[PDB]
Design a binder for these strands. Structure first.
Lengths: 99, 744, 51, 51
RNA sequence: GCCUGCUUUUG
RNA sequence: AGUAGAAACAAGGC
């Protein structure tokens, strides 16, 4: 809450309130610099994102085999080992996998 | 190593260094001669982009006028002035549907304003084209000459003092056969200066009342080529005043406008609007921002669409209101244009030069001109009537910006998702000839479709977008009127750079303005403290060199380096002297908000303090409260604004001298009128002191009120006070003789 | 410069007529040494950026 | 080196006040310094200019 | 010899 | 010549 208005911070990806430039490595909050961010060598550059969904991983980009793009609020139907497609973020489709 | 500053942009972003991309330390481009060519270009352009319409001949002017309204639909992405009535009215209707009561309330406010306001409101403004002289004059001069000719002819309703009566007069003056005017001359062999009467038939008066003056705009930042601009007359001024009042009242109630707000209000509104959009937008939705300019914005926009808009906004109002707001778009649909100074010709063999006025381009052989100009004249010759070209199908630069913004917001309001009937939508921000659009959709196909629909819905109204100068990125970064938003607005500081020198008003005023822009730029821009100290130092160097006021403990020979040394040696306390009298500078960040006299008032010597600050000085001139501590300054990328400076009235608060060229011209007799009027008004302020603080009111001649107050003050001051009997009798005798002079 | 910055910031930039922009830049490069040098610098910037 | 040249009132006026250039540069420099001083809560002129 | 050195500059 | 650059200056007016 900021001046009675709900600023939304996006879990997956950048936002106008929270954006990390990948070029000059500066972090930016609300138009104000908040420090240069350093390169951990253990940064998994594998395309996988395990901290976006609750009980699901993100294996990569979409594939047309596993059907159309399910949505965030209709994922409890799935079960163990059931890969699927999900549209999230700024209109971006991805593949996911349950644990 | 070879040096490249642009490579700095490989580490620092372009918005956090955009000040480097503004070359505002050098002289700006200027025009040198005539502006006839650019006038012709604009006329033939706006007749080109509206050419498939239909031609007609006015019965009153005899002029060929091109009507493109409800013309064919465009077939390519070139500019078009083919506007459609039904879609304009649908835009207005949906606007009122989404923001109900907007037109009613705005009309009520403007009705109050219409009923109360006065003719004196026309005195304040910019210059004005005077049909009485066929050139530009100040606003009050034009008003006065127009009123004089009216009263000389018979129109006298403006004696009421209201504006709407002056408008009734200018309307009633069009239904007269032979208007009469008076013209200045002067002859010397003995300088004889007089006047002569002449007549103006009805059609002549109409073309003079409907025409605009044109001239080229100097000191433009950001363009390779020069532009032409227009200046309207005195008769189209009250009507457009009321129209822009209505448009202001409307645009104030719209979250999309940017025109009636300035400075930080503008940026605040923009930022609040962007946040509101990004909050109403969804998280699964893709979002993009177009940074956009419109091409040929002032040529496509037609007054007939403005008349449609007016008649829809005055729906269910009194007919006098509907009829006093309908006259501006009429008079700007039958308008004309003066071409200008003309051209100049050259002969190398005989070694001579010549000038050619614009009022012979219809009656001149085209051998002299080059190809481009020959083509121009060839196209324009049909439209010439008495040295002025017909121009119906478009506006000119700098007028109806508010109502044009209303139309822009009307188009932006067609992206509410209950008017698109789909899953994409849009909104944005609009100022005249600049905009920022924000488009939302679940994919890139919807983004393209929304962009296409915006383009087409805007082409149905005559709004063309510059593809050459527009670009689309994701949300977070954009540009709007030289404001660079990067997740927040950003400071530039080079727009404000020509404001850091001597302003050229007087010593006190230039000093105060110089320190005040430094502290302002410390607040608003991001000028640091050390750089501000340096700015002080450099400003004081420029101040001293311009005004020839060096420290006094120096050996710099100027024309007043002797008086200042005598003042230096007389004076005991030298930290109390002003920089203009040869003293030091005690300014720093701590005390930039204090004038130069209060800063050093305990340090002054009493004799200097009493000489400098003396009301009997002959150098000071205060006339009216609206001009006491207020100066016109001329920024980069804007019009001449007015700056308030805190200062104390001293002997350094002088006025500089005048141009003095008008002595050599036929219109020399305006000086004598000015001089006599100033004598009379000065004497009136002697009798009535409040005449410069509060506007007087009355119907009597000035002499009547003057002699009356003389008698009253004489009586009241003799009864209990200073006046004896001799003075009483003598001044009553003088009053009697004044009566014998006025009444006979 | 600003659309290139939008590309470096990974903001998916786009245009409607880029050759018009180039034709408008090139319309001003005529005969001044300082301006041609700035243009040369801009070409070097595009070469070292855009990578 | 001998030459004929020419100038105008406005060109003189604007070359009579070139000291403003000193501000432009310096302003940008201080901005950069301040942009780091906000990050590391300390003044950074000494680090930049010496180290 | 006399007079002049911005007499026409959008928002 | 030179300044400059889509039209002007290289003094003008009576």
């Amino acid at each position: 809450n900021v001046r009675g208005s709900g600023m939304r911070i996006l879990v997956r990806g950048n936002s106008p309130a929270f954006n990390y430039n990948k070029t000059t490595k500066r972090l930016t909050i609300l138009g104000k610099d908040a420090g240069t961010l350093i390169e951990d060598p253990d940064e998994g550059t594998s395309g996988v994102e395990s901290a976006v969904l609750r009980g699901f991983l993100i294996l990569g980009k979409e594939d047309r085999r596993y059907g159309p793009a399910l949505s965030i609020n209709e994922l409890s139907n799935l079960a163990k080992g059931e890969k699927a497609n999900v549209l999230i973020g700024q209109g971006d489709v991805v593949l996911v996998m349950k644990r | 190593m070879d040096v490249n500053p642009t490579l700095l942009f490989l580490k620092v972003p372009a918005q956090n260094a955009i000040s480097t991309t503004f070359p505002y330390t050098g002289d700006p481009p200027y025009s040198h001669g005539t502006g006839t060519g650019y006038t012709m270009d604009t006329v033939n352009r706006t007749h080109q982009y509206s050419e498939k319409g239909k031609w007609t001949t006015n019965t009153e002017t005899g002029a060929p006028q091109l009507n493109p309204i409800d013309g064919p639909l465009p077939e390519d992405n070139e500019p078009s002035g083919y506007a459609q009535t039904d879609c304009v009215l649908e835009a207005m209707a949906f606007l009122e549907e989404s923001h109900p009561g907007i037109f009613e309330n705005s009309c009520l406010e403007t009705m109050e304003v219409v009923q109360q306001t006065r003719v004196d409101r026309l005195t304040q403004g910019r210059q004005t084209y005077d049909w009485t002289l066929n050139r530009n004059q100040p606003a009050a001069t034009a008003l006065a000459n127009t009123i004089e000719v009216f009263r000389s002819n018979g129109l006298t309703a403006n004696e009421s003092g209201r504006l709407i009566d002056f408008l009734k007069d200018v309307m009633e003056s069009m239904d007269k056969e032979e208007m009469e005017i008076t013209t200045h001359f002067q002859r010397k062999r003995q300088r004889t200066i007089g006047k002569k009467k002449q007549r103006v038939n009805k059609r002549s008066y109409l073309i003079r009342a409907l025409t605009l003056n044109t001239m080229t705009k100097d000191a433009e930042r950001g363009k390779l080529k020069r532009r032409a601009i227009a200046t309207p007359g005195m008769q189209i001024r009250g009507f457009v005043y009321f129209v822009e009042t209505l448009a202001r009242s409307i645009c104030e109630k719209l979250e999309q406008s940017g025109l009636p707000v300035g400075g930080n209000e503008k940026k605040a509104k923009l930022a609040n609007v962007v946040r509101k959009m990004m909050t109403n937008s969804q998280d699964t939705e893709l979002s993009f921002t177009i940074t956009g300019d419109n091409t040929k914005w002032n040529e496509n926009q037609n007054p007939r669409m403005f008349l449609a808009m007016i008649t829809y906004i005055t729906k269910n109002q009194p007919e006098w209101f509907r009829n006093v707001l309908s006259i501006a778009p009429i008079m700007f649909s039958n308008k004309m244009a003066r071409l200008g100074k003309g051209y100049m010709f050259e002969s190398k063999s005989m070694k001579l030069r010549t000038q050619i006025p614009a009022e012979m381009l219809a009656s001149i052989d085209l051998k002299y001109f080059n190809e481009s100009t020959r083509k121009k004249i060839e196209k324009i010759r049909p439209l010439l009537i008495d040295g002025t070209a017909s121009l119906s199908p478009g506006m000119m630069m700098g007028m109806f910006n508010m109502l044009s913004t209303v139309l822009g917001v009307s188009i932006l309001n067609l992206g509410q998702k209950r008017y698109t009937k789909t899953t994409y939508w849009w909104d944005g921000l609009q100022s005249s000839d600049d905009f920022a659009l924000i488009v939302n959709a679940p994919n890139h196909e919807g983004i393209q479709a929304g962009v296409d629909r915006f383009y087409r819905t805007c082409k149905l109204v005559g709004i063309n977008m510059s593809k050459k100068k527009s670009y689309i990125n994701r949300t977070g970064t954009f540009e709007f009127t030289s404001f660079f938003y990067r997740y927040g607005f950003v400071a530039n500081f080079s727009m404000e750079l020509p404001s850091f020198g001597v302003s050229g008003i007087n010593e006190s005023a230039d000093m105060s303005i110089g320190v005040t822009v430094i502290k302002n730029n410390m607040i608003n821009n991001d000028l640091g403290p050390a750089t501000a100290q340096m700015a002080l130092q450099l400003f004081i160097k420029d101040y001293r060199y311009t005004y020839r006021c060096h420290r006094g403990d120096t050996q710099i020979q100027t024309r007043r380096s002797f008086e200042l040394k005598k003042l230096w040696e007389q004076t005991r306390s030298k930290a109390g002297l002003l920089v203009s009298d040869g003293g030091p500078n005690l300014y720093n960040i701590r005390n930039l908000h204090i004038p130069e006299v209060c800063l050093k008032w305990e340090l002054m010597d009493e004799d200097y303090q009493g000489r400098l600050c003396n009301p009997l000085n002959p150098f000071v001139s205060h006339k009216e409260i609206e001009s006491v501590n207020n100066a016109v300054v001329m920024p980069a990328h804007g019009p001449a604004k007015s700056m308030e400076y805190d200062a104390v009235a001293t002997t350094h608060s002088w006025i500089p001298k005048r141009n003095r060229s008008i002595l050599n011209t036929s219109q020399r007799g305006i000086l004598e009128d000015e001089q006599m009027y100033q004598k009379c008004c000065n004497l009136f302020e002697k009798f009535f002191p409040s005449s410069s603080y509060r506007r007087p009111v009355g119907i009597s001649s000035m002499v009547e009120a003057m002699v009356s107050r003389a008698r009253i003050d004489a009586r009241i001051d003799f009864e209990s006070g200073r006046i004896k009997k001799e003075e009483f009798a003598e001044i009553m005798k003088i009053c009697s003789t004044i009566e014998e002079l006025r009444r006979q | 410069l600003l659309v290139v910055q939008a590309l470096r910031d990974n903001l998916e930039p786009g245009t409607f007529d880029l050759e018009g922009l180039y034709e408008a830049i090139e319309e001003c490069l005529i005969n001044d040494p300082w301006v041609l040098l700035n243009a040369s610098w801009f070409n070097s910037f595009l070469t070292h950026a855009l990578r | 080196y001998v030459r004929t040249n020419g100038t105008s009132k406005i060109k003189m006026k604007w070359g009579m006040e070139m000291r403003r250039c000193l501000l432009q540069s310096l302003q940008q420099i201080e901005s950069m310094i301040e942009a780091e001083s906000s990050v590391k809560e300390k003044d950074m002129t000494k680090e930049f200019f010496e180290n």
